[PDB]
Amino acid sequence: PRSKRSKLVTLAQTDKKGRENKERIFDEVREALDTYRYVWVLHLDDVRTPVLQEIRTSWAGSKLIMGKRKVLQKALGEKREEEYKENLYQLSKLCSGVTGLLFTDEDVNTVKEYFKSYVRSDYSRPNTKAPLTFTIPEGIVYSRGGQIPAEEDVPMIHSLEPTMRNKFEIPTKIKAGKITIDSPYLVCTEGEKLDVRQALILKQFGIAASEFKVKVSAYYDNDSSTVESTNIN
Template identity: 35%
Template sequence: MPKSRRDKEISLTQVKKKTREHKDNIISEIQDAVDKYQNVFVYSIDAMRSTKMTEIRQHFKTNSRFFFGKNNVMAVALGRDSATEKADGLHKVSQLLKGQCGLMFTNEDVKSIKKYFKDFSDSDYARAGQEVDQDISLPEGPLPQFPFSVEPQLRKLGLPTKLEKGNVELIQDFEVCKAGDKLTPEQAKILKLLDQKLSTFRVNLVAHWNAKKGLTLY
C-alpha cells in the first residue's frame, strides 16, 4: 500500500536553529554597537512605512546603526537589569522597549538628530486597522473625480452610486469615516480612491542614553 503524503515527516530542526542563530546575531550586533557608538536613542514610529525607514537609514548610513522590532531580543542584548546590562544604565533603556519601537546607535551630534526627526514626516494613505482623526463624508450628487468605469467598484465598496448619463453620482449622502474609526479594508480603499491621505509617517524620539550622561527621557 502506498504511503500517504499526509504521513510525511518534516524536520523543524533546521528552522529552529536558524531562528536561534538569527537572534544570537542580533544580540551580538547590538552589543558591538554599544561599544562602537556614543549615543543610543529609543524611538517609536507612527504609521510605519518601510520605504521611509530605508530613506532614514540611508541618510545616517555613515555614522549610525538602526535596530527595529524584536523588543525582547534587544532587551536581552542591552541587559534587563543592572547585573546583566552591557553598560551602566542600559537596563533602563531596555525597560522602554514596548510596542512598535527601535534603537538608533549613532555618533551624530544629538542636536542635529533631534532636529532631523522633528522635521521629518510624510503623508500617506491610511491602511486598514489604522485609527483616523478626521471625519470624511460625501454629499449626494455628482462625483466628477471618478470615470464611469470605476462606478461598479464604488458600489462594491459600499457607496450608494449610480450612472447618470455616463457620470458617477451618489444617490444619498455617504459617511466614509469618523474621527476615532479603525478603518475597514473598504474604508481604506475608498479614502485612497478619494486621494485622502490621513496617515503621517513620523519617528518619535522616546529617550537618549549616553555613557557619560546616562538616560534622558523626552
C-alpha cells in the first residue's frame, strides 16, 4: 500500500459532475434538434468567456450548446444507422475540436455574414505566428514592455523577476525595486511560429494583437434533412 505518490487534497466547494451532466447535454441537444430548424457547427478552439457570452447575448432566441465532442457525436449519430435524423452523421463527422453546436430558426445568410464580419482582438495563442515584433528596451522594463511611452506606465512588480528569469528564460537583474536588463531582448518576429513562452511573454505584457474570427464548417436543415459545407471565418 506504499511507495505511491500522495494525492494533494484540497478543500473547495465545487465538485465533479459525472455522467449526469453528459446525459443532460445529450437530452438538451436531442430535444433542441426537434425544435429548431437549422443547426450549425462552430470551431472555437481558444476563446474568452466574455467573447462567448457576447456571441450568446447576440441572440437569446437561438441556442448554443458546448460540451464534449464524443457526446455531441453520439447525440447526432456517428454511424449512418445510429442517428437521430437522416444524413446527420455527415454533419457529426465535421466536428474537429472544441465545437460549439448552434441551433437557430434564422436565415442562412444572416448567420453567414455575422460569423465572418465578427472579429475581435485576442492573444497570439502558441503554435500560431503573430503579426508583431518586439525588442524590449535595454533599461528598465515597464508593465506594458515597449508599447506606449514609459512616462505613462510604471515599472512592473519585483515579484515577476523569478518568473521572467526562470520560466521565460529572460536574462534579468533588479536594481532597487525596479527590474532591469542590459540589452534589448527580442522576443518574436513576424511570420515566426510562436512557442509557449513567447505567448506567455506577450500575454504578461498585455498584447491582444491577433484576430479572433470564429470558423464555421457546415450547416444542416431539418425540413430538407441535408448537409451543406461552407468554410467561413
